[PDB]
Amino acid sequence: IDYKFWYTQPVPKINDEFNESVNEPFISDNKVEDVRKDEYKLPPGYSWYVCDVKDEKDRSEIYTLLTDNYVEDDDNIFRFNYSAEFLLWALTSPNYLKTWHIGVKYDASNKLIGFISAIPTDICIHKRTIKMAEVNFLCVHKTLRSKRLAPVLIKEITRRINLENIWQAIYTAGVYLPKPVSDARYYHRSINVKKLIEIGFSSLNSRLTMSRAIKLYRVEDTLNIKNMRLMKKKDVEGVHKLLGSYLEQFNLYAVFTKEEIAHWFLPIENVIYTYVNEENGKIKDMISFYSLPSQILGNDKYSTLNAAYSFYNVTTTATFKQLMQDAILLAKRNNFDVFNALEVMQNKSVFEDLKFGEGDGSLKYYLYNWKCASFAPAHVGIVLL
Numbered sequence: 001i002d003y004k005f006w007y008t009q010p011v012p013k014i015n016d017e018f019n020e021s022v023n024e025p026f027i028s029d030n031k032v033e034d035v036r037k038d039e040y041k042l043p044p045g046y047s048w049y050v051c052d053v054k055d056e057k058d059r060s061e062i063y064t065l066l067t068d069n070y071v072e073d074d075d076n077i078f079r080f081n082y083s084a085e086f087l088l089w090a091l092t093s094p095n096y097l098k099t100w101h102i103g104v105k106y107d108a109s110n111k112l113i114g115f116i117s118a119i120p121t122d123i124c125i126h127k128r129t130i131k132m133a134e135v136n137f138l139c140v141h142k143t144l145r146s147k148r149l150a151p152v153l154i155k156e157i158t159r160r161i162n163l164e165n166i167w168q169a170i171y172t173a174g175v176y177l178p179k180p181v182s183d184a185r186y187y188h189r190s191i192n193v194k195k196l197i198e199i200g201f202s203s204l205n206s207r208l209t210m211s212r213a214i215k216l217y218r219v220e221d222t223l224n225i226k227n228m229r230l231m232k233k234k235d236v237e238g239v240h241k242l243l244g245s246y247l248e249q250f251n252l253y254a255v256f257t258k259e260e261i262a263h264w265f266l267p268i269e270n271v272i273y274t275y276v277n278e279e280n281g282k283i284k285d286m287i288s289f290y291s292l293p294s295q296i297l298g299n300d301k302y303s304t305l306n307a308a309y310s311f312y313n314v315t316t317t318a319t320f321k322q323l324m325q326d327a328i329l330l331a332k333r334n335n336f337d338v339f340n341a342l343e344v345m346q347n348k349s350v351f352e353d354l355k356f357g358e359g360d361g362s363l364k365y366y367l368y369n370w371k372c373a374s375f376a377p378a379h380v381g382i383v384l385l
């Protein structure tokens with residue numbers, strides 16, 4: 001459309017296409033010393049608030065704000081319902097800064113009505129490793145929409161990030177913005193198909209009756225990789241090598257340290273599920289998925305859809321199809337209703353045979369202050385929360 005805000009920022013124009021050899025900032029030679037030391041102005045009666053995600057009550061305020069005002073699907077059937085414990089995990093990874101968890105309070109109610117967050121990460125884009133901020137959980141209260149508050153939150157966080165001598169960022173959104181480096185459709189594999197029909201999501205007909213739909217999505221309760229088990233602290237070094245080598249093939253991926261592997265994969269109930277196959281004290285295969293429920297808006301019977309989201313999956317002893325079939329099984333054993341995956345990495349190759357259905361949209365991958373050729377989602381090797 002016009003992108004009056006986005007076009008002031010070091011991002012590509014809607015028309016911009018770069019050749020494969022281009023891989024650099026839009027604006028280089030930035031100076032920490034020149035970064036504005038003042039907070040961006042909020043409109044009258046609003047104030048910046050530094051959230052302490054480790055404090056249960058500050059964390060619960062962020063939780064409420066998102067439970068009520070965060071992303072909905074295009075038909076407003078669903079709203080993401082990230083749990084408080086999930087938010088603690090997503091925001092307190094290694095070297096996180098408390099000052100990159102930025103809230104906005106309405107002074108007179110003392111209530112949180114705005115939020116944005118970033119955590120630091122090393123990102124490899126087209127074989128160049130860049131220290132970046134990963135931005136996530138940008139949210140304005142439904143009652144305050146289209147008032148140009150989002151660019152204030154975006155400018156304030158960019159300012160705080162630049163204070164740490166960091167000048168690039170990664171982010172994802174379902175909305176089209178200038179301009180994606182990659183665009184990945186999502187797919188869904190029904191697990192609790194009766195529930196899915198009942199809330200309006202899945203479709204039946206003459207050929208596909210209720211009983212036939214249930215038969216179609218039945219899984220055998222036996223693993224292809226018999227020894228696949230929950231990840232444990234002893235597996236951190238093994239996972240780090242398995243995953244770190246795997247990821248090198250891609251055009252876009254995080255370069256995880258050991259401390260990151262421990263944070264991002266060690267299992268937490270209702271948050272992150274990681275499974276490993278150990279042979280001879282070596283980790284040869286791994287499955288992971290995170291738990292992201294959606295709230296079901298205005299269904300009499302159900303209020304929550306429990307959804308497992310494919311995270312990182314690597315196999316060296318089975319086919320990728322057998323690995324993902326095990327991942328679906330492990331999601332089913334843990335009470336999930338549906339398993340969601342993007343057409344990143346090798347994922348697309350299994351979607352047909354494993355009975356995934358194509359969804360109604362896509363997740364776009366973005367870089368801030370970085371010029372490079374865009375690429376097909378098969379070359380994307382990072383999954384953001």
Ligand SMILES: CCCCCCCCCCCCCC(=O)CSCCNC(=O)CCNC(=O)[C@H](O)C(C)(C)COP(=O)(O)OP(=O)(O)OC[C@H]1O[C@@H](n2cnc3c(N)ncnc32)[C@H](O)[C@@H]1OP(=O)(O)O
Pocket residue numbers: 002003004005006007069070071072133135136137138139140141144145146147148149150151154157158161162166167168169170171172173174175177368369
């Ligand atoms: C070097 C470090 C750099 C760090 C920074 C990196 C950049 C990080 C960027 C952030 C990454 C976040 C990633 C992330 O969190 C994951 S994507 C999820 C974003 N959150 C939601 O969708 C929750 C529901 N929606 C809302 O709360 C509001 O609709 C929000 C706050 C989204 C927009 O509030 P609003 O009341 O609806 O709108 P105004 O205040 O009037 O503002 C309109 C301006 O906002 C642009 N807009 C709309 N949605 C956007 C989105 N998802 N990203 C970026 N920009 C977005 C829009 O194009 C327009 O600019 P334009 O006029 O140019 O078109």
Ligand SMILES: Cc1cc(F)ccc1-c1ccc2[nH]nc(CN(C)C)c2c1
Pocket residue numbers: 071136172173174186187309310340341342362363384385
């Ligand atoms: C529905 C879905 C399925 C799937 F397998 C992977 C991703 C999505 C999805 C679609 C739109 C979204 N907007 N914001 C988010 C949250 N973040 C990832 C930032 C988001 C996620």
Ligand SMILES: CCOC(=O)c1c(C)nc2ccccc2c1C
Pocket residue numbers: 071072073074078079080188201294305307338340359
């Ligand atoms: C069958 C379940 O998967 C989905 O269709 C789904 C859900 C549950 N929540 C969402 C929340 C926000 C944006 C999109 C969403 C989509 C696409």
Ligand SMILES: [Cl-]
Pocket residue numbers: 155
């Ligand atoms: Cl400004």
Ligand SMILES: [Mg+2]
Pocket residue numbers: 140144145146147148149150
């Ligand atoms: Mg606004």
